[PDB]
Design a protein around this ligand. Sequence first.
Ligand SMILES: *[C@@H]1O[C@H](CO)[C@@H](O)[C@H](O)[C@H]1NC(C)=O
Ligand SMILES: *[C@@H]1O[C@H](CO)[C@@H](O)[C@H](O)[C@H]1NC(C)=O
Ligand SMILES: [Cu+2]
Ligand SMILES: [Cu+2]
Ligand SMILES: [Cu+2]
Ligand SMILES: [Cu+2]
Ligand SMILES: [Mg+2]
Ligand SMILES: [Mg+2]
Ligand SMILES: [O]
Ligand SMILES: [O]
Ligand SMILES: [O]
Ligand SMILES: [O]
Lengths: 650, 650
Amino acid sequence: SSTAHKQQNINHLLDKIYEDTKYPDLQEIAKNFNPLGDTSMYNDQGAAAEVLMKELNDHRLLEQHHWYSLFNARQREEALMLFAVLNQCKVWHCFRNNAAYFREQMNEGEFVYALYVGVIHSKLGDGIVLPPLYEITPHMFTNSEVIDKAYSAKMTQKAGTFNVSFTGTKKNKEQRVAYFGEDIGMNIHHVTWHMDFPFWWQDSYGNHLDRKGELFFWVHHQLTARFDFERLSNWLDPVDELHWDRIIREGFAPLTSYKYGGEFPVRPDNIHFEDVDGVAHVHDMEITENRIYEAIDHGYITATDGHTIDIRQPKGIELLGDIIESSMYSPNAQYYGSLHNTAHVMLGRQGDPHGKFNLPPGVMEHFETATRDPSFFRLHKYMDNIFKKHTDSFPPYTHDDLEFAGMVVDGVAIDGELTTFFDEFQYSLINAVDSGESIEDVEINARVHRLNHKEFTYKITVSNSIGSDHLATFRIFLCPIEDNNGITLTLDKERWLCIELDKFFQKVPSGTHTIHRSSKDSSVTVPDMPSFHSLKEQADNAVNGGSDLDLSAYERSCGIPERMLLPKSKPEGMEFNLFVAVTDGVKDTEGHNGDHDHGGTHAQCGVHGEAYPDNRPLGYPLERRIPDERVFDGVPNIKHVVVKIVHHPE
Amino acid sequence: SSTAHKQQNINHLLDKIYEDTKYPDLQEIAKNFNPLGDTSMYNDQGAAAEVLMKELNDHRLLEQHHWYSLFNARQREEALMLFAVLNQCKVWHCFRNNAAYFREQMNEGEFVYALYVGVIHSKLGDGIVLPPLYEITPHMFTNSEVIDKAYSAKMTQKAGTFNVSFTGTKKNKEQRVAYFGEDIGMNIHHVTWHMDFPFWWQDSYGNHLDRKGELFFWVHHQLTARFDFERLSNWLDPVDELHWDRIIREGFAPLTSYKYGGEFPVRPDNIHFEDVDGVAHVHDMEITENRIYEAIDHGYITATDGHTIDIRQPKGIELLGDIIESSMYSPNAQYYGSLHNTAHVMLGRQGDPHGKFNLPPGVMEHFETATRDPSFFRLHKYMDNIFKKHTDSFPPYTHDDLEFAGMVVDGVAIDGELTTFFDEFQYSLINAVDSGESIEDVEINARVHRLNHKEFTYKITVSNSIGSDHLATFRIFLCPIEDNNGITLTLDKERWLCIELDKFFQKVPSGTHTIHRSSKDSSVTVPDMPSFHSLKEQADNAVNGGSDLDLSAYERSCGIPERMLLPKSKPEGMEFNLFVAVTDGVKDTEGHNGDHDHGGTHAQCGVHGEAYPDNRPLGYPLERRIPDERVFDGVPNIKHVVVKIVHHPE
Ligand SMILES: *[C@@H]1O[C@H](CO)[C@@H](O)[C@H](O)[C@H]1NC(C)=O
Ligand SMILES: *[C@@H]1O[C@H](CO)[C@@H](O)[C@H](O)[C@H]1NC(C)=O
Ligand SMILES: [Cu+2]
Ligand SMILES: [Cu+2]
Ligand SMILES: [Cu+2]
Ligand SMILES: [Cu+2]
Ligand SMILES: [Mg+2]
Ligand SMILES: [Mg+2]
Ligand SMILES: [O]
Ligand SMILES: [O]
Ligand SMILES: [O]
Ligand SMILES: [O]
């Protein structure tokens, strides 16, 4: 019931997840605990526990040792039944005991999902650090070749560390950017964002997820823009957008497998979409798309009873994210459907669209794996352009809109060269292999090459010519100067390609002062996850003894990995525009304070258990059309400078 | 150097083929034997050993733990270099020592292939029974799910027997006939036929393979006709033929994996052929096809210098098989290419035709696996129709052609009901899993359901009204009466669909006599292979002690499995025409004797180390057009009767 004991409990529950628990205390609980024995431990007096126990007793739950997809409606419903129980627990012993009990009864994929979102969305989970999913379920992050070497290492009872190479061949130009969507941390960022902001969320679970639909737009806009920056760095053109009536040019072979369920399916190059039995017809996707664009071009969403909901206003983008994803916040799912989530399944199933071949779900049908597929970025550019029609519909900002009166950016510079490189990172495959009973384990690791960069610090010189210190928001973006054809981009053509590097609030005293901000402190990024082995060691050292470790150290798992803050760029160097906008922090943070702690990842992942701290539209001030660059040049609190990034190859 | 010791040596060499040998004697030989140390052990005084050793010493051979395809030109060349050495050994110690030495140096797939064809084509191999390849390399015969359970059984050190189900789902109508092409014995029949009659054979290896090109036509004609009989039994239409300019309707997901190389690739439904980089353009296949048909319709094959080779003669079909397969017997590979073998690769590679995805060869690129793919039978019907244009070009047989004067078939009947069913068969997966060092093995088996039938005996009453006993050939075929639409077939429309059930030579004494022939004695079929475990036990029992076991018991591994002699048919029963032709055995066997032993599989697999014993065209007397059924009805030595086959489901 302390953080050390809770962390250890979670560590134990997630250990060797494909086998019955090996911890005597958890075995005893799974044997003897009755989820219905004392309903006073629940806030709903047992309602959720009754629902799940009835499903269990009627033999209606998915078996153990079976693939699980969050996009599968019934499997999701089953996972959410366990989430609902955990979420109702008043105290930790309820949470732990129900987790231990249902770990041994329910499908492992459902259980892991429910336990993670249960920890994230319950106050009882505060202070717990979830192990990286690439060590809890390594199959979802590790190609089949390396798993086989792990299987071989286990079959032969010999330790080893095995190198993971990217999918494809050098003949496949898309392999040039495999280090983006295949990065294990980028995959954790993506799954964790959706765990923090789930489309199935209903506020009856206990609280509201502030601005979720707009953050849904923004986080995926940033994934798309970041991927395109890697393409530009590797002599590739931007991704095309998907369209339902045109071929998906770039196929994909994941070369990965489920632990149970077989190899992930492949998609050949240059295929037309086919209807997917049990999911949707291609034509249904076109109609859904049309209906969303009808709302955007009408300027209003149509409610279930036909009345209009105005979207010509700052929350319009959020309501659009609600209906596009779609989430349970959608005002009218009967009419607007679920374009984005259904599209994930439509794409994921194109290797077996009629269920003739007994193929498991595609990589697009899991947030753990979706960015590994090149078609992820074609789909999300397509979706991004829907949002962009709405954001482009507003009048361009004026001088008066943008000016922070009395605040001028005199200069922008960086301390330290902008240098990227690849280094090596290891994670454990032990959870992927079968052990027991009464046979000892051996160390089995994967080694991956990952993008990284050297530390740097921004130097932003501002002059506050008001006679008072003022809170300011510093908004930092990296923008392309030229496209892959060497063509110089206008600001209007740059703005939608810019990637967010940082956003922070800082008091600017009167006078001229230099603000320093380290790359490591970015509110866009989070560090590499601590290893499962490290979390066990720290939790065990605390429990066996008694030591209050400041676990309030790790960031969150949602956020672009720190190592991927910068695009790869080129060995010969590339020049980019570093764009800084300094805006009125008093107005931006009204209702959430400026001195308050906002965590390490508020730019795209918000603040755990709090409202979103920045009132401005996501992407401000680049999210509206800029047809006249003179407007931005005339605003003293906006400035961009040219910076150079060099890739250091091996 | 005796059969017991040779069998044990082979057993040891093939044991746990993915790991260094565990037998101390073979380890010593691999360490100390010099293939170039005493050239007097070779018939070529070491020429072949020098070629292979140079390749080995120059690091030019395929690494161990890598996929192998006989259709890969360079990998085949490497395997054949080892075959060439084994084939030159004068005595067994040369054969054994070179096998042991190169087992530890060469790729395991190349080694197994070379060792099998070396045993088959060397007189030193006489009396050896090769273990079934499904136990030597189980990955090539076992779906990935079951291998994973084997991997799990090994990782956990627990014995088990695991059920293999057919690929696909019940929504896939092609799964109705998966028991044909996925039968492990049918796969061994196919690989062994090609090992007995390899397209790479050159007579400089020591002997000629009699009528090989015509047997190539015939064995594949019979595979195609037998598959279509299973389709008819399961309410399916006949397979369509492939065409290079039309879609391949039926895709395929093997759900199988290589031990090294990854999962076998899938082919989606309804794809057009694409050019395959490094293999051929689709257009090249069309041109090759056209050139073959030009020879057929000209009535002659064009030699390299332009002179004509007449094919309007009994050996024409053989020369066509030579140029179509193509084999090294082809008179003009520069012009006629290799339609059939290239088509195997063209089909096999359609999941990755441009090498972008790092996918290993398809199931069509191994004789072990090719019949698992539905497209196998569409390709081979296409090829079969090329041969049929030639065979249809000859004048129909006349009464005088067909009559065996003084020999009448008075009656045809069967002792015993014709009943099919499915039963269970087990084979070991131990060679598929990793062991060692110094850790004990455990029993790991696959259980498959396989077609089978009850024993029956033909009763053929003949009257020999010549005043002398006469040798006769009994030719027995099963022919459809109606197609899948309930339409009654004419004899001309039946004949190409008939399947060979038996062919035997027997002296018919003067008078009226009943000939009895058991289904078990069919010259078309061979029994199930003895298990690797059984072969080890019998060889070990002989070596450790001294006992001359009549190993001259097992048939061969080439031949339709006995269990698959009859089509499945239907639970409600199906009627077929049983066609018996009794022909002049003196003329049919001229040059090969009648009383001589022809083995158990001469109909399609010939006689090991001897000429083909039947002079008639393969398929006689059904291989020419029969436009006038009156001709066959007027021949007393031909008779057909209606028989019923019933399937007994579980
Ligand atoms: C794996 O990578 C490490 C460093 O990244 C290297 O030392 C080692 O040689 C590699 N192993 C293999 C088998 O290539
Ligand atoms: C496997 O098949 C056997 C007989 O074919 C049967 O007894 C057994 O129940 C099957 N096992 C499973 C797990 O279905
Ligand atoms: Cu997402
Ligand atoms: Cu998405
Ligand atoms: Cu063949
Ligand atoms: Cu073939
Ligand atoms: Mg299922
Ligand atoms: Mg290779
Ligand atoms: O997403
Ligand atoms: O996504
Ligand atoms: O073949
Ligand atoms: O074949």
